[PDB]
Amino acid sequence: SYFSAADVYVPDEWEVAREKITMSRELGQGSFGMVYEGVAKGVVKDEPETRVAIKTVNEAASMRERIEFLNEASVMKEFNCHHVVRLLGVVSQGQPTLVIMELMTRGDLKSYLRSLRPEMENNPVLAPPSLSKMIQMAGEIADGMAYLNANKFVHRDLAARNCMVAEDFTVKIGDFGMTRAIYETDYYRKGGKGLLPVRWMSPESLKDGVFTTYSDVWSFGVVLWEIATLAEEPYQGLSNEQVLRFVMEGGLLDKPDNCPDMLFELMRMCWQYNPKMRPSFLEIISSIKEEMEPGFREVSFYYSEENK
Ligand SMILES: Cc1nn(C2CCN(CC(=O)N(C)C)CC2)c(C)c1Nc1ncc(Cl)c(-c2cnn3ccccc23)n1
């Protein structure tokens, strides 16, 4: 009279010995538990030791919660791309439960962009990012997204808060779902389907709640706008409800102050009302590849043999 509904986590080849992991600096609190920086032995080829981020579930959490955490985190096991944050191992044996991730020392891109805003202290400050630096970020994000699309995924929440920034300033698609609870006001719940990033969503997505790679491209345009405004709220001064109506009826974000023409042109291609007229992520990269740093050819999905 029924199918069993019991969820489990099955230890696999990603399991790492607890003795190989040490945790130091606290990075923050996730929905599941605390996240730390640390060091992991033997998790990267040719590296005796690697700096890592360690997501934890402590001894007080329920086993149901524990298993949910492990199965959610495990989605990242399928990916191996320079521009997607890597999962490096799992400690499911004993407690606390650990998931070991590539460390992104400069944080999420929204936080990073906001950190570049001048302080209200009249001190000397780095000028806003150059076109060349913004283009580099764009290409890296687009490469990670092309990789995900090639692996038949739709992201559904592409936004600066869901990209991460490495020590060397490389931007990558972030660990899935790790910042939505922190930037809670970037979401709006209107019904079933729950909390949706309405200010990042395409007109067609706002209309019927379906997401495609075409709507990921729309969101990519909004990310470029975020980069150019240092992460202002899109459609600031419109309520959540007013955004739905504005975008569905054809309204667009304005060209940011001092935004280079090239970048806004790219935004406009992403924001074509008809999804079929938007470029693909591969086509986006093709258009800016001459402006990418030379090493992009060695590490990108775009130039890899997997891009066929
Ligand atoms: C995303 C991020 N944030 N940070 C820090 C945060 C503290 N400061 C912010 C600031 O401005 N300070 C003045 C302190 C520097 C940046 C660092 C190193 C990271 N890297 C990183 N890499 C990989 C992962 Cl999987 C995670 C991560 C996942 N879930 N999760 C939940 C909470 C926190 C992190 C994470 N995080």
CA of 53 to the centre of ligand 1 (A): 8
Give the tokens for residue 43: 């998790």
- Residue 183, domain CATH: 1.10.510.10
Q: How far separated are the first and last CA of the chain, in Å rounded?
A: 47
Ligand 1 binding pocket includes 108 (Cβ within 6 Å): yes
Ligand 1 binding pocket includes 103 (Cβ within 6 Å): yes
Q: Which residue, chain included where needed, has tokens 């899935």?
A: 176
CA of 190 to the centre of ligand 1 (A): 29
What's the full length of the chain, in residues? 308
222 plus 247 within the same structural domain: yes
Last residue of a domain, one of 45, 67, 100: 100
Could you say which of 108, 143, 157, 186 is catalytic?
Answer: 157
Sign of the dihedral defined by the CA atoms of residues 133, 84, 285, 304, in that order:
positive
Q: Which residues of 263-273 are buried (b: 16+ CB within 10 A; e: fewer)?
A: bbebbebbbbe
178 plus 200 within the same structural domain: yes
**Do the domain assignments include residue 115?**
yes
Q: Tell me which residue range forms the domain holding 36.
A: 1-100
Q: What is the resolution of this structure in A?
A: 1.9
105 plus 88 within the same structural domain: no
Amino acid letter, residue 53: A
95 plus 112 within the same structural domain: no
DSSP 106-123: T-BHHHHHHHTSPPTT--
105 plus 185 within the same structural domain: yes
**Do the domain assignments include residue 306?**
no
CA of 101 to the centre of ligand 1 (A): 11
**Do the domain assignments include residue 308?**
no
CA distance 193 to 215: 16
CA distance 6 to 165: 37
**Do the domain assignments include residue 169?**
yes
123 plus 269 within the same structural domain: yes
What SS3 string covers 153-217?
A: CCCCCCCHHHEEECCCCCEEECCCCCCCCCCHHHCEECCCCCEECHHHCCHHHHHHCCCCHHHHH
Give the tokens for residue 291: 């402006």
* CB-CB contact of 217 with 281 (8 Å): yes
DSSP 7-23: ------TTB--GGGEEE
157 plus 285 within the same structural domain: yes
69 plus 197 within the same structural domain: no
Ligand 1 binding pocket includes 84 (Cβ within 6 Å): no
75 plus 109 within the same structural domain: no
Give me the number of domains the chain comprises.
2
Binding-site residue set for ATP:
27-35, 55
Ligand 1 binding pocket includes 252 (Cβ within 6 Å): no
**Do the domain assignments include residue 112?**
yes
138 plus 200 within the same structural domain: yes
Angle among Cα 81, 70, 306 to the nearest 5 degrees reads: 20
**Do the domain assignments include residue 307?**
no
DSSP 222-258: HHHHHHHHTSPPTTTTS-HHHHHHHHHTT--PPPPTT
- Residue 28, domain CATH: 3.30.200.20
Instruction: Choose among 172, 174, 171, 192: nearest CA to 183.
Output: 174
43 plus 157 within the same structural domain: no
Last residue of a domain, one of 79, 100, 121: 100
Catalytic residue status for 216: no
CA 196, distance to chain mean position in Å, is 15
| Cβ-based neighbours of 267, under 8 Å, separated by 6 or more | 221, 224, 225, 253
